[PDB]
Design an enzyme around this catalytic site. Structure first.
Site, PDB file in Angstrom:
ATOM      1  N   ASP A 163       0.802  -1.226   0.000  1.00  0.00           N
ATOM      2  CA  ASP A 163       0.000   0.000   0.000  1.00  0.00           C
ATOM      3  C   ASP A 163       0.845   1.292   0.000  1.00  0.00           C
ATOM      4  OD1 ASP A 163      -2.541  -1.204  -0.272  1.00  0.00           O
ATOM      5  OD2 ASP A 163      -2.843  -1.448   1.834  1.00  0.00           O
ATOM      6  N   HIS A 222      -0.996   2.096  14.292  1.00  0.00           N
ATOM      7  CA  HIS A 222      -1.604   0.840  13.903  1.00  0.00           C
ATOM      8  C   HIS A 222      -0.947  -0.442  14.416  1.00  0.00           C
ATOM      9  CE1 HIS A 222       1.474   0.803  11.009  1.00  0.00           C
ATOM     10  NE2 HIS A 222       0.797   0.958   9.887  1.00  0.00           N
ATOM     11  N   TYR A 235      -0.761 -14.953   9.713  1.00  0.00           N
ATOM     12  CA  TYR A 235       0.358 -15.157   8.795  1.00  0.00           C
ATOM     13  C   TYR A 235       1.655 -14.374   9.161  1.00  0.00           C
ATOM     14  CZ  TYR A 235       1.068 -10.975   5.805  1.00  0.00           C
ATOM     15  OH  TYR A 235       1.418  -9.720   5.335  1.00  0.00           O
ATOM     16  N   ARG A 236       1.554 -13.434  10.106  1.00  0.00           N
ATOM     17  CA  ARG A 236       2.640 -12.519  10.474  1.00  0.00           C
ATOM     18  C   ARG A 236       2.162 -11.690  11.680  1.00  0.00           C
ATOM     19  NH1 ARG A 236       5.994  -7.563   7.315  1.00  0.00           N
ATOM     20  NH2 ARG A 236       4.414  -7.569   5.675  1.00  0.00           N
TER      21      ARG A 236
HETATM   22  C1  LIG Z   1       1.438   1.422   8.454  1.00  0.00           C
HETATM   23  C2  LIG Z   1       1.016   0.472   7.296  1.00  0.00           C
HETATM   24  C3  LIG Z   1       1.806  -0.658   7.062  1.00  0.00           C
HETATM   25  C4  LIG Z   1       1.554  -1.537   5.999  1.00  0.00           C
HETATM   26  C5  LIG Z   1       0.484  -1.267   5.154  1.00  0.00           C
HETATM   27  C6  LIG Z   1      -0.314  -0.141   5.374  1.00  0.00           C
HETATM   28  C7  LIG Z   1      -0.058   0.737   6.434  1.00  0.00           C
HETATM   29  C8  LIG Z   1      -0.784   2.045   6.449  1.00  0.00           C
HETATM   30  N1  LIG Z   1       0.219  -2.106   4.089  1.00  0.00           N
HETATM   31  C9  LIG Z   1       1.046  -3.179   3.835  1.00  0.00           C
HETATM   32  C10 LIG Z   1       0.820  -4.005   2.744  1.00  0.00           C
HETATM   33  O1  LIG Z   1      -0.009  -3.695   1.884  1.00  0.00           O
HETATM   34  N2  LIG Z   1       1.657  -5.093   2.528  1.00  0.00           N
HETATM   35  C11 LIG Z   1       2.719  -5.351   3.371  1.00  0.00           C
HETATM   36  O2  LIG Z   1       3.458  -6.306   3.155  1.00  0.00           O
HETATM   37  N3  LIG Z   1       2.940  -4.527   4.449  1.00  0.00           N
HETATM   38  C12 LIG Z   1       2.066  -3.495   4.722  1.00  0.00           C
HETATM   39  N4  LIG Z   1       2.344  -2.663   5.769  1.00  0.00           N
HETATM   40  C13 LIG Z   1       3.379  -3.151   6.744  1.00  0.00           C
HETATM   41  C14 LIG Z   1       4.741  -2.486   6.514  1.00  0.00           C
HETATM   42  O3  LIG Z   1       4.582  -1.081   6.454  1.00  0.00           O
HETATM   43  C15 LIG Z   1       5.441  -3.038   5.267  1.00  0.00           C
HETATM   44  O4  LIG Z   1       5.322  -4.444   5.314  1.00  0.00           O
HETATM   45  C16 LIG Z   1       6.925  -2.677   5.170  1.00  0.00           C
HETATM   46  O5  LIG Z   1       7.370  -2.817   3.827  1.00  0.00           O
HETATM   47  C17 LIG Z   1       7.766  -3.558   6.102  1.00  0.00           C
HETATM   48  O6  LIG Z   1       8.888  -2.880   6.617  1.00  0.00           O
HETATM   49  P1  LIG Z   1      10.288  -2.829   5.813  1.00  0.00           P
HETATM   50  O7  LIG Z   1      10.025  -3.074   4.376  1.00  0.00           O
HETATM   51  O8  LIG Z   1      11.040  -1.497   6.034  1.00  0.00           O
HETATM   52  O9  LIG Z   1      11.219  -3.990   6.411  1.00  0.00           O
HETATM   53  P2  LIG Z   1      12.089  -3.918   7.764  1.00  0.00           P
HETATM   54  O10 LIG Z   1      11.448  -3.160   8.861  1.00  0.00           O
HETATM   55  O11 LIG Z   1      13.565  -3.626   7.479  1.00  0.00           O
HETATM   56  O12 LIG Z   1      12.126  -5.460   8.195  1.00  0.00           O
HETATM   57  C18 LIG Z   1      10.995  -6.156   8.645  1.00  0.00           C
HETATM   58  C19 LIG Z   1      11.528  -7.426   9.296  1.00  0.00           C
HETATM   59  O13 LIG Z   1      12.085  -8.277   8.307  1.00  0.00           O
HETATM   60  C20 LIG Z   1      13.284  -8.878   8.766  1.00  0.00           C
HETATM   61  N5  LIG Z   1      14.440  -8.405   7.980  1.00  0.00           N
HETATM   62  C21 LIG Z   1      14.530  -7.243   7.246  1.00  0.00           C
HETATM   63  N6  LIG Z   1      15.760  -7.185   6.696  1.00  0.00           N
HETATM   64  C22 LIG Z   1      16.451  -8.291   7.055  1.00  0.00           C
HETATM   65  C23 LIG Z   1      17.740  -8.730   6.763  1.00  0.00           C
HETATM   66  N7  LIG Z   1      18.366  -8.243   5.692  1.00  0.00           N
HETATM   67  N8  LIG Z   1      18.178  -9.928   7.303  1.00  0.00           N
HETATM   68  C24 LIG Z   1      17.348 -10.683   8.113  1.00  0.00           C
HETATM   69  N9  LIG Z   1      16.067 -10.236   8.398  1.00  0.00           N
HETATM   70  C25 LIG Z   1      15.629  -9.066   7.867  1.00  0.00           C
HETATM   71  C26 LIG Z   1      13.466  -8.465  10.209  1.00  0.00           C
HETATM   72  O14 LIG Z   1      12.920  -9.495  10.989  1.00  0.00           O
HETATM   73  C27 LIG Z   1      12.645  -7.190  10.307  1.00  0.00           C
HETATM   74  O15 LIG Z   1      12.113  -6.984  11.588  1.00  0.00           O
END
Ligand SMILES: *Cc1cc2c(cc1C)nc1c(=O)[nH]c(=O)nc-1n2C[C@H](O)[C@H](O)[C@H](O)COP(=O)(O)OP(=O)(O)OC[C@H]1O[C@@H](n2cnc3c(N)ncnc32)[C@H](O)[C@@H]1O
Ligand SMILES: *Cc1cc2c(cc1C)nc1c(=O)[nH]c(=O)nc-1n2C[C@H](O)[C@H](O)[C@H](O)COP(=O)(O)OP(=O)(O)OC[C@H]1O[C@@H](n2cnc3c(N)ncnc32)[C@H](O)[C@@H]1O
Ligand SMILES: C/C=C/c1ccc(O)c(OC)c1
Ligand SMILES: C/C=C/c1ccc(O)c(OC)c1
Lengths: 550, 550
Positions: free
Chosen positions: B160, B412, B493-494
């Site tokens: 999104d 959220h 699922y998460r």
């Molecule tokens: C606020 C919100 C969030 C949201 C959304 C709508 C709103 C208004 N709609 C989403 C959607 O349509 N689909 C979706 O998948 N997510 C949605 N979100 C949730 C969130 O905002 C997004 O998912 C976002 O893209 C996730 O955060 P990001 O992409 O920045 O990833 P991150 O915080 O770095 O990591 C998340 C977790 O993944 C593991 N991780 C990440 N990097 C690594 C590395 N390289 N190595 C090992 N593990 C990794 C970690 O566990 C981390 O906590």
């Protein structure tokens, strides 16, 4: 029974006998046989490799065991951990060209999972999946669909023959020819017995069906699954499912497989390509069609000799003992009304959509000089189009078994490298492959199967299994090809018992980091290394690499 | 820096100071911030949970370190092994609703992978894929494609919002809205730093690019991939890729993701469904059209409050303190020209084909009275459809941030159980979740996203993050929904950091065999247990369950 030809490593005759008496007491005498015959595809052997490239008895069971149910598997796992006894799980054992039933390690028990664990456990219409035990062949599942009139609701996705195991194949990551061709990717929710002997279901199989009076006191193996177990693969958490494809990490007792709803209309086709060289342009054409999705399925690109070999043995085309020359393939092509390469696909859904896609595909291929197009009715009774017309709609058959008999005691062995969907890489791979087959004194036979962004190039090595000199040339061809292809940036996706170590040694990016990692996991879950030691070149620590690798 | 707010367990102050001195030496003090403020979405915090359900400082980093390159990662790991120092790896940290960038264990070094490891490494046209590092956001990549005119050949797939990491989100098994919406399934060729420090590439990433003069003496990290790496996920042997999604099994440094070719035709759309109970027949109608690919992407079914909240905050629609009545939600429906449920889809490809699809869908939904079909051109300029027009064609937006502000200091929290694609199941999941939402004094807000055979049901809990009375009520809500959904055979699922333990305890079929088998693999590859302890409820042996679980 008292005396086998081959004992498992480090095991005494007296220990072996205690094991066997023990197992008899669980599963009955009728489900145990000690080896103190290559069989048929219709009645597969369970003792060894029926399509042997090494000596007939090189990969040999010490016995075969057929558990009655999942409890037996657990009890058997227990004793093998007790006695330090290698198991080799098969479903059906029709893995010919990859070793059949044969165990990587001689002296192993072959676990014939298929004989008694047979049942189609569920076919769910609304969810469009089925749930399955090792013993359910493609044909078996075909017949369950007919009995219950589901043919008009749900289709299957079948490999080139009807007898392999739906699960057998799926965990080997095998391939069929409807839009549901990626067999491994169609699973959700597998149940597995681990090397410790404990039961585990994957994904949403780990989320249990809530309690109700009807299911109380059911052994875990017999519990139903929660409503999403065969719908959403990931479950929650790290996604371990794939650790069970092509691994020795566990013994699969059940699997769910997604099934395609009757599509609303179906049309198969042949496009024939006149010149050997047309393969190059033909693949460049395929690329965007596949990628853009005018190609709905896994269409294959067949070399001429594959259709010819279906159609009759080599004596049927020439008394020649050397490979057929470049110019005889032209004669055979034109006898059979085929091209040098022959492209098979199909179209799914309503007429109006089939029309459009067909006109796109028809148009695109017409850029190749001499191209010709056929529906099933435009070809003779015996055609490969007729047969495949079945295959790309999920009907199991057996007509393609005939090519195995290209030579007087025909066995097959598959060399299975992966190519880009690009004319240039494809031609190179062909060239590299064709060259060597020649030096080996063999006809080149092979398909390309078309995945979204890759092709599975199945070079079909056929040989006279009674011929020792040829057998050795087959061992030379395979080993040489593996190397040639690695030196050209290509890996193989699946292989035979005798080539597993070699193939893995090829996936040696960064000092063999992949295999090291896999061993760490293997030894933790398998501290006694009793499951399938040596599968995919993964060896438990009690297996010396020096003693055990080829 | 010297004195931190919370130290990692079993580690002295003296040790933390020698540690960070060693890291400061490697990464330079510009890539180290020791913690001794919530921010927003554009400037995301790296220290804690911006949408905190627990105390603001409950999950808290001791420091944030920003590796410059793959080699800094190997050293930090080597040192985290030296000192038994938990690492919490992030890519962008926009995991809002799930804990953002907060570590599950307070005291950990948040590993800011994305600050410097930043590069779109490859965009390959004929293969139709990209290779990416953690630091690349969806917007980052979009601008890469525009800046090279690639948007005419290749489209992206976006959630999104556009701020998320392409790689980070995929390893979280997240979802988007084109036919490429199953983000994880689209990966191929992953690079991973292991808990022991060693680099590994999966699949054909393990098949080395052949030697040549241009690439001699390149650090493994910097080496190219063989031609098939990002074309064919499986490679050979056990398929271990999924052990690296939603896991603590490693630190991902690079991923290949498949990109969908421009389809040659696009048209989004909305369908409005008047009544609250129209969800049931809607889902029942979607089911066959999903399985049959009339619906090609991942369409969404939005609650009226989701759309309402994007356009305006709660204070603007009602002054009421309690949840909104049913009649007051028909008032907002008729006000905004939406139904109670709103179905957003999109058609892909050539017109002759888009047309047929559309007539089937229109005709399928017509059995619902008062239904209304709209294209983007048919709506107000601010409309959600106009936003999702861009979304369902791979264009990033930020407009959907506005619903977080449905409450004063809105935050959220996602409750994401999985439902069947059946009106009965979906109504049931709705009722269950609506009941408890009332009890807790929240409005119910959510979407269903339509996977092929499953729906992801995103229950959007928004709460006032400065209201301790409501944050406790949200905690109660979450923990009860988990239990209730479980009791009705659904799993999430998460989830968020504070529910990881509970949710995982939910998948306890056969006495937590899934977790036990997960634990076993973890301690094998992470002896000292340094990488992300507690991710998905998986704890290494030196973290007492008694001490650590929530
Ligand atoms: C606020 C919100 C969030 C949201 C959304 C709508 C709103 C208004 N709609 C989403 C959607 O349509 N689909 C979706 O998948 N997510 C949605 N979100 C949730 C969130 O905002 C997004 O998912 C976002 O893209 C996730 O955060 P990001 O992409 O920045 O990833 P991150 O915080 O770095 O990591 C998340 C977790 O993944 C593991 N991780 C990440 N990097 C690594 C590395 N390289 N190595 C090992 N593990 C990794 C970690 O566990 C981390 O906590
Ligand atoms: C002869 C030949 C083979 C063939 C083919 C055409 C010809 C003429 N066309 C194929 C095709 O188009 N696509 C394809 O994937 N394979 C094709 N083959 C090969 C073969 O006939 C089939 O693939 C056949 O289905 C495979 O044999 P089967 O299905 O019976 O599997 P198996 O013999 O039981 O062995 C499977 C291996 O996988 C692991 N395995 C199997 N069961 C388990 C369980 N229960 N638990 C754990 N692991 C299991 C084992 O490693 C076993 O060795
Ligand atoms: C001939 C067909 C064939 C044989 C063996 C295989 O493994 C395979 O996989 C696509 C295809
Ligand atoms: C609202 C959108 C959303 C939020 C969190 C998720 O996990 C998700 O995946 C389907 C979608």
């Amino acid at each position: 029974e008292f005396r086998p030809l081959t004992l498992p490593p480090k095991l005494s005759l007296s220990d072996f006998n205690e094991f066997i008496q023990d197992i008899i007491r669980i599963v009955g005498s009728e489900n145990v046989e000690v080896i103190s015959v290559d069989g048929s595809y219709m009645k597969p052997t369970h003792t060894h490799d029926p399509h042997h490239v090494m000596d007939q008895d090189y990969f040999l069971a010490s016995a075969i065991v057929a558990p009655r149910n999942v409890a037996d598997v657990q009890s058997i796992v227990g004793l093998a951990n007790k006695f330090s006894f290698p198991l080799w799980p098969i479903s059906i054992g029709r893995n010919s060209g990859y070793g059949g039933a044969a165990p990587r390690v001689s002296g192993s028990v072959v676990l014939d999972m298929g004989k008694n664990m047979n049942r189609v456990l569920e076919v769910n219409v609304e969810g469009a999946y089925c749930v399955v035990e090792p013993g359910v062949t493609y044909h078996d599942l075909h017949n369950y669909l007919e009995a219950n009139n589901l043919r008009d609701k749900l289709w299957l996705d079948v490999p080139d023959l009807g007898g392999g195991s739906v699960l057998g194949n799926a965990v080997e990551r095998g391939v069929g020819y409807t839009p549901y061709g990626d067999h491994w990717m169609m699973h959700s929710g597998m149940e597995v017995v681990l090397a410790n002997g404990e039961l585990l279901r994957t994904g949403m199989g780990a989320l249990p069906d809530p309690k109700r009076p009807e299911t109380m006191g059911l052994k875990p193996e017999d519990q139903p699954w929660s409503k999403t177990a065969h719908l959403f693969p990931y479950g929650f958490g790290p996604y371990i499912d794939g650790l069970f494809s092509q691994s020795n990490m566990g013994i699969v007792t059940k699997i769910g497989i997604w099934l395609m709803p009757n599509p609303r209309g179906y049309q198969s086709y042949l496009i024939t390509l006149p010149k050997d060289g047309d393969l190059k342009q033909a693949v460049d054409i395929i690329r965007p069609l596949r990628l853009g999705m005018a190609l709905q399925n896994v269409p294959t690109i067949r070399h001429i000799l594959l259709d010819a070999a279906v159609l009759g043995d080599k004596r049927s085309y020439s008394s020649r003992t050397e490979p057929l020359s470049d110019e005889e393939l032209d004669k055979i092509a034109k006898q059979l009304n085929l091209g040098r390469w022959n492209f098979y696909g199909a179209l799914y859904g309503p007429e109006p959509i089939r029309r459009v896609l067909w006109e796109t595909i028809k148009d695109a291929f017409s850029a190749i000089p001499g191209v010709k197009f056929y529906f099933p009715e435009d070809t003779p009774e015996n055609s490969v189009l007729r047969v495949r017309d079945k295959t790309m709609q999920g009907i199991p058959t057996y007509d393609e078994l005939k090519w195995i008999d290209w030579l007087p005691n025909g066995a097959h062995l598959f060399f299975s490298p992966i190519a880009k969907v690009s004319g240039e890489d494809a031609m190179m791979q062909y060239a590299v492959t064709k060259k060597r087959c020649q030096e080996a004194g063999l006809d080149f036979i092979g398909t390309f199967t078309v995945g979204m962004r890759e092709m599975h190039h199945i070079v079909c090595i056929v040989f006279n299994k009674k011929d020792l000199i040829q057998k050795r040339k087959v061992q030379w061809l395979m080993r040489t090809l593996i190397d040639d292809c690695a030196a050209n940036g290509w890996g193989e996706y699946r292989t035979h018992l005798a080539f597993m170590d070699q193939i893995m040694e090829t996936y040696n990016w960064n000092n063999s980091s992949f295999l090291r990692f896999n061993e760490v996991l293997k030894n933790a879950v398998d501290p006694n290394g009793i499951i399938a030691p040596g599968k995919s070149g993964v060896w438990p620590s009690q297996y010396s690499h020096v003693t055990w690798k080829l």
